[PDB]
Amino acid sequence: MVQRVTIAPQGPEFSRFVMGYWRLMDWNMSARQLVSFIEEHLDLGVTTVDHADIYGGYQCEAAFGEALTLAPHLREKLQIVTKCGIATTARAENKLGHYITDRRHIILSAEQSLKNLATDYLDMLLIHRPDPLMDADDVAEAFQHLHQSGKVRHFGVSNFTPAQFTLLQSRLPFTLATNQVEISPVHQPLLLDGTLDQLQQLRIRPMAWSCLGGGRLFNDEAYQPLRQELSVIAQELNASSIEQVVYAWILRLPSQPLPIIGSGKIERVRAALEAETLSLTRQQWFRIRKAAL
Template sequence: MQRIALTEDLSFSRIVHGMWRLAEWDMSTQERLTFIEQCIELGITTFDHADIYGGYTCEGLFGEALRLKPELRDQIEIVTKTGIKLTGDFNPGQTLNHYDTTKAHIIRQAERSLQELAIDQIDTLLIHRPDPLMDPDEVAEAFTALHESGKVRTFGVSNHLPSQQRLLQSRLPFKLVTNQLELSPMQLKHFEDGAVDLCHEERMPLMAWSPLAGGRLFSEEDYAPLRDTLHTIAARHDVSGIDTVVYAWLLAHPARILPIIGSGKIERVQSGVEALKIELTREEWFEILKAARGRDVD
C-alpha cells in the first residue's frame, strides 16, 4: 500500500476507510474487529470518523472493537471531526442543528472522541464544516491546547473553501495537514473553485469523501453515460468494477488525493485497493471527465 506523508512523523495509507455508516452494518463487536483487521491486512491503516456519525455512536462502536485488541492502535491512524451539533438525545434541549466551533465545544468533543475511540491521542482532528460564526483565534486556542496536552497530533479542515482554510491557517502556529472534500467525477466543484488547487499549492494531501456519490453512481439515470464510459475503461484494464476505475481516477490526480471508502463489505474495500494497480492514461482521465460533464473540453 502506498503511503502519503502529512508531516515528518505522520503518514496515511493512500486508501482511507470511512466509518460514517458503521452503525448501519449490524456487526457484532468481534465482527467489527475482524473487519478492521481485514482492512489492515489490505494495507489500509487510516480510519476516518466524526463525533456525529451514527447519531454520535460510531466512534464508540469502533472503540468497543479496539478494546478487544488494544495493540492494533499502534498499527493505525485515526482521523475524526467535530464542529456540528445535532438535535436529539445527545444534546437535550437543543432545538436546531447548528455549527459550534467554540473552544469549549472543540475541546469537549475531542476529549469525548478519545474516550469513545478508546485511544490516548487523535492523529488528526478536523473542523467538520465551515462555521459562519467561527472565531479563528478561538479555534486556534482550542487546537493549541489539545496539541500541547498531547491529545491531538495534527489538525485539518473538512469541506472548507480556500478563503476559509486560509483564514484559519492565518491564526495557527502550525500547519493544517489536510482538507477533506467531496470529490468524484459526480462532484467536480472543488476542482473548479480553488479548493483542490490550494491544497496542491500548499503540498497538503487532501481526502476525498463520497467518491461514489453515496452509491448513486450505480443507479441514477443521470449517471448512465458516465457508467458506460467507466465500464469501457474497466474492461480495458481488466478490472471488474467501475468503482475501481473511479478510485483510480482520483488517485491519478497530482494533488495526492486519498479516497475514502465507506463500505462495510470487504470485497468493496478490496476494489478500492485494486485501483492502486491501475495507471490511467491522460486521455482516459479526460474521457471520464467528459462523460461526467457531458461535454468535451473547451
C-alpha cells in the same frame, strides 16, 4: 499493500486509501465482527480510519471503541482521524442542526472522542464544516491546548474554501494537515474553483469523501448510462470493476487525494485497493470527466 503517504509538511503518515466509518451503524456488526473487519483491512495496508463525533447519531465512535477495547493491540497500528463542529438533532438539546466551533466545545468534543474510541490520543482532529461564526482565534486556542497536552497530534479541516483555510492557518504555528473535500466524476467543482489548486500549492493532500458520488453512481437511475462509459474504460484497462476506475480517476489528480472508502464489506475494499495499479491515460481521464458532466 497500500502505499504509505505523508499528507502534509510535518504531517502524519497515512495509508493512501482511508477506511471511512460514517456508516458503521448501518452495517449491523457486533464488536467481534468489527474487530475482524479492522484486522482484515489492516492486513491489506489500510491503517488510516475516518470518524466524526456526529456519525451514526453520535454512536459510531463508541461502537468503534468497543472493538478497540476487545483488541487493545490494534490502536498502535491505526491512524485515527475524527471531527467536530456540527451539532445535529440526534441530541435533544439541539433543536435544529447548526455549527459549534467555540474553544470549549472543541476541547470537550475531542476529549469525548478519546473516551468513545477508548484511546489516549487522536492522530488528527478536523473542523467538520466551515462555520459562519467561526472565530479562528478560539479554534486556535483549543488546538493549542489539545496539542500541548499530547491529546491530538495533528489538525485539519473539512469542506473549507481557500479563504476559510487561510484564515484558520494564519492563527496556527503548525501546518493544517488536510482539507477533507468531496471529489468524484459526479462532483467536480473543486477541480477548478481553487480548492485543489491551493492544496497542491501548499503540498497538502486532501482526504476525498463521496468518491462514488454519494451513492448516485450505482443508485441514481440517471447515471445508469454513465455506469456504461466507466464499464467501457474498465475493459480497456482490464479492471475488475468500475469502482477501481473511479478511484484511479481520483488518484490521477495532481493534489494527490487520499480516497475514503465507506463500504463495510471487505473485498469491495480489496477491489478499491486495486486502483493503485491502473494507469489511466489522459484521454481516458477526460473521457470520464465529459461523460459525467
